[PDB]
Amino acid sequence: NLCPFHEVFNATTFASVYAWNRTRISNCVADYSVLYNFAPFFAFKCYGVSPTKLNDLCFTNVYADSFVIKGNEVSQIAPGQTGNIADYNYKLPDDFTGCVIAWNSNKLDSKHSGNYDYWYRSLRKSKLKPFERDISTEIYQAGNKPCKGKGPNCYFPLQSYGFRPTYGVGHQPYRVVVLSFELLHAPATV
Amino acid sequence: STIEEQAKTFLDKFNHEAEDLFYQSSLASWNYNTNITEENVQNMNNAGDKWSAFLKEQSTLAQMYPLQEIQNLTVKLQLQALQQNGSSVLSEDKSKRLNTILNTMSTIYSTGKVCNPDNPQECLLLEPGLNEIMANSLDYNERLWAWESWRSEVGKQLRPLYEEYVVLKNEMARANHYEDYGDYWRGDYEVNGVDGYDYSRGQLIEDVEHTFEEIKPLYEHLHAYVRAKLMNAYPSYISPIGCLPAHLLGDMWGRFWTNLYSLTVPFGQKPNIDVTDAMVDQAWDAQRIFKEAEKFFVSVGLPNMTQGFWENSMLTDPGNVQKAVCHPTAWDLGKGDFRILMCTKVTMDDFLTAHHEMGHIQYDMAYAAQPFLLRNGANEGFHEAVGEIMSLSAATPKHLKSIGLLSPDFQEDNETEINFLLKQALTIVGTLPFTYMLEKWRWMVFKGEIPKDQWMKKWWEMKREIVGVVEPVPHDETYCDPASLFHVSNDYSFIRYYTRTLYQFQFQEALCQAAKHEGPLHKCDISNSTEAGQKLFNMLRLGKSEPWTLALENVVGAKNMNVRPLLNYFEPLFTWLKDQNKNSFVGWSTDWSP
Numbered sequence: 001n002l003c004p005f006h007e008v009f010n011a012t013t014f015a016s017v018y019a020w021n022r023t024r025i026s027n028c029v030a031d032y033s034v035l036y037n038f039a040p041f042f043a044f045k046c047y048g049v050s051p052t053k054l055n056d057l058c059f060t061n062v063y064a065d066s067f068v069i070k071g072n073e074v075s076q077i078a079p080g081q082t083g084n085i086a087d088y089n090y091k092l093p094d095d096f097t098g099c100v101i102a103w104n105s106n107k108l109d110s111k112h113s114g115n116y117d118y119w120y121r122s123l124r125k126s127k128l129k130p131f132e133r134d135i136s137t138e139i140y141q142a143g144n145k146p147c148k149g150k151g152p153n154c155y156f157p158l159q160s161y162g163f164r165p166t167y168g169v170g171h172q173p174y175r176v177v178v179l180s181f182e183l184l185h186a187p188a189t190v
Numbered sequence: 191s192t193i194e195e196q197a198k199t200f201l202d203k204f205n206h207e208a209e210d211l212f213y214q215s216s217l218a219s220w221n222y223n224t225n226i227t228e229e230n231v232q233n234m235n236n237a238g239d240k241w242s243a244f245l246k247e248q249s250t251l252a253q254m255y256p257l258q259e260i261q262n263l264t265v266k267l268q269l270q271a272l273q274q275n276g277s278s279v280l281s282e283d284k285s286k287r288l289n290t291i292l293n294t295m296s297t298i299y300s301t302g303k304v305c306n307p308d309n310p311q312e313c314l315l316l317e318p319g320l321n322e323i324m325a326n327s328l329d330y331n332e333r334l335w336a337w338e339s340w341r342s343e344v345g346k347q348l349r350p351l352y353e354e355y356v357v358l359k360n361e362m363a364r365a366n367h368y369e370d371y372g373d374y375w376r377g378d379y380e381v382n383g384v385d386g387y388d389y390s391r392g393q394l395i396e397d398v399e400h401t402f403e404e405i406k407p408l409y410e411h412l413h414a415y416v417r418a419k420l421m422n423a424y425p426s427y428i429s430p431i432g433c434l435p436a437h438l439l440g441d442m443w444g445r446f447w448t449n450l451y452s453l454t455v456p457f458g459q460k461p462n463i464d465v466t467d468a469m470v471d472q473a474w475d476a477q478r479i480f481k482e483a484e485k486f487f488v489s490v491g492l493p494n495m496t497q498g499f500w501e502n503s504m505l506t507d508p509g510n511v512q513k514a515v516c517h518p519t520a521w522d523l524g525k526g527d528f529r530i531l532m533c534t535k536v537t538m539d540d541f542l543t544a545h546h547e548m549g550h551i552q553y554d555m556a557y558a559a560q561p562f563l564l565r566n567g568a569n570e571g572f573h574e575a576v577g578e579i580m581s582l583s584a585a586t587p588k589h590l591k592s593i594g595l596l597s598p599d600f601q602e603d604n605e606t607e608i609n610f611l612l613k614q615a616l617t618i619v620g621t622l623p624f625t626y627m628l629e630k631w632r633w634m635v636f637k638g639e640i641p642k643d644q645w646m647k648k649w650w651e652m653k654r655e656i657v658g659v660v661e662p663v664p665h666d667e668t669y670c671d672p673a674s675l676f677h678v679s680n681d682y683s684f685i686r687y688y689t690r691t692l693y694q695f696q697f698q699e700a701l702c703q704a705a706k707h708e709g710p711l712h713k714c715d716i717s718n719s720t721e722a723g724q725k726l727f728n729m730l731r732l733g734k735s736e737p738w739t740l741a742l743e744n745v746v747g748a749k750n751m752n753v754r755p756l757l758n759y760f761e762p763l764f765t766w767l768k769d770q771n772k773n774s775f776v777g778w779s780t781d782w783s784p
């Protein structure tokens with residue numbers, strides 16, 4: 001058969017960065033021509049595996065994440081990076097083996113009046129360990145007084161993404177699909 | 191958590207919300223500027239309203255972090271910029287009265303009209319008719335009549351409003367932990383907190399006075415030459431002792447001497463160079479001028495320009511349909527959106543203005559990486575200095591020959607150099623004493639050395655001793671002659687232009703020094719020189735993070751205002767003027783009266 005790689009790149013909508021979506025693509029025959037056939041990619045990196053040597057490699061689990069970020073925040077999707085995304089939203093392990101694919105999507109993620117349906121986390125008590133999800137909207141207390149609600153020294157942790165078609169190039173939406181390759185002692189199915 | 195940490199996580203939320211609300215306000219203003227419609231006046235107004243509300247709630251929440259415990263310089267600067275009480279420190283009724291008086295001032299100045307002579311239908315407005323009749327005129331009577339009529343129609347109806355406005359603004363400034371309104375305006379050129387680079391308002395006054403004292407010889411020689419030239423064309427009207435009439439000087443207020451070239455040309459046989467015919471012969475459209483400007487900027491070393499600058503910004507007049515305004519402005523919406531609003535044609539003026547606005551655009555792209563409250567020039571004369579140095583570099587004959595607007599067989603002579611130097615001097619060095627005198631008068635009026643009942647006689651005295659122009663007719667104290675200027679009636683500062691010229695000449699000298707140029711300074715060119723571009727960008731990227739005394743030092747090697755580069759620029763003209771007016775008298779005596 002064929003791997004469900006098409007339904008990941010061809011999704012009608014993409015989840016937010018602070019709440020990304022992970023799908024396991026085990027138990028299928030890898031093709032990779034679907035990912036090689038899509039639109040030109042603003043970025044295409046793979047650490048650990050050669051792009052061409054992907055056909056003969058046998059793996060047991062292939063994960064596929066999906067989110068939407070800005071243009072100048074794409075460079076933070078890499079092992080050993082510091083920023084607002086790599087600390088609180090999405091972190092990759094220092095030992096990584098997979099490909100990172102991104103492509104500009106301005107025609108689909110711009111409402112000309114504020115596409116406030118995309119959110120990211122800017123305030124957190126501690127950094128995020130690799131491959132962790134944190135979906136919470138509890139008030140963040142930055143002062144020395146207990147917080148009874150929104151007000152002085154009490155902020156909403158999330159921050160909205162406002163996307164417009166007239167923005168620059170670093171403030172435009174970019175859909176990112178990373179492909180983490182996991183190798184285990186169990187027999188390989190991919 | 192300490193106070194520096196609370197300040198830091200409060201200043202990040204401000205930054206995000208503010209960039210969004212400013213983009214919406216600015217896109218609303220562009221849509222109004224590019225297309226005038228009541229819906230557009232309506233939306234400009236609603237978005238401005240939401241921005242002002244945010245700013246005030248955040249400056250009322252930003253008052254809980256004292257500056258005595260903040261150590262970081264950038265955080266302290268942002269908090270200081272966000273903690274200003276402003277006009278809100280006044281009472282509600284007083285604030286409303288001040289706003290109404292400012293609004294009525296703007297309305298009377300904008301819609302002021304003189305129609306007394308002949309039938310009332312003979313109505314002449316300022317911009318269409320008065321400026322046109324003042325730019326070119328050969329009759330004494332009409333110029334004197336226009337001057338007196340405008341001065342009366344302004345002062346007679348504007349003096350009490352100016353008195354009330356002065357009193358209210360002085361009270362507000364005193365309540366704002368200052369000395370007067372002049373001190374409030376002078377607080378911009380202030381550095382405090384870093385050792386080695388410190389400044390004060392009195393230091394600024396002393397520096398301005400010292401620079402004017404150093405520069406006075408050149409202006410005296412230029413004034414003597416101008417008076418000698420005007421004697422022949424306008425006989426039996428100017429005494430040789432000096433003090434040319436204020437009205438008989440070109441511009442309505444005599445801010446510039448640009449339109450005096452037709453009467454003060456050194457050599458009429460050799461005309462100044464022009465490339466309008468060259469541009470129109472090669473079918474140069476509005477796109478090619480900006481393409482060539484971008485090519486020059488990228489040849490210097492600065493980066494290219496985004497596509498959104500090409501698709502979004504408009505560069506040509508949209509015709510009778512969809513009327514707009516033609517004022518060349520470099521728009522910076524903030525979220526990676528840079529646009530230019532201007533209608534261009536085949537003219538040298540547009541060719542230079544393209545580079546002038548592209549300089550501001552490059553500055554904006556350079557400092558766009560700074561936080562929201564630190565995205566500005568170090569002073570108010572830093573943007574214009576960059577614009578004018580790029581314009582100066584783009585107008586050299588060598589550059590014009592290189593780009594292709596002039597024949598390669600063309601040759602330059604000393605007569606053309608003298609003509610160009612005099613053209614530059616009539617605009618740059620001819621507007622410094624007027625600015626200095628006006629700013630000094632405003633400072634003394636605001637602070638209190640000037641009696642309330644003595645406002646016009648001392649103004650004319652200072653104009654006589656400093657600028658060197660007398661009143662054509664006596665004026666009683668009821669008049670409010672200074673208020674006729676656009677800047678004073680609309681609450682604007684004026685020292686910015688003096689500071690801008692003094693900074694721009696230093697910047698040009700320092701930049702073309704590093705390009706390995708040998709010869710006169712006025713022929714310096716920066717094309718095809720990456721070192722100068724890198725040196726300029728090093729200060730461009732700073733923004734307002736560092737004090738101006740350090741940004742200035744990073745480029746020219748000096749941390750203060752200097753006038754030596756300005757005198758070096760006009761050295762051949764100074765020598766020629768010294769050689770010229772050796773038979774005529776030099777200087778003026780204020781004893782002349784009508």
Ligand SMILES: *[C@@H]1O[C@H](CO)[C@@H](O)[C@H](O)[C@H]1NC(C)=O
Nearest residue numbers: 006009010011012013105108
């Ligand atoms: C998905 O695939 C279809 C056809 O395979 C194509 O028309 C479409 O542009 C792709 N992308 C989206 C977002 O639907």
Ligand SMILES: *[C@@H]1O[C@H](CO)[C@@H](O)[C@H](O)[C@H]1NC(C)=O
Nearest residue numbers: 011012013015020021022023
């Ligand atoms: C996202 O992940 C969920 C499980 O977390 C899965 O059920 C779903 O199919 C994925 N895709 C979309 C578009 O929701």
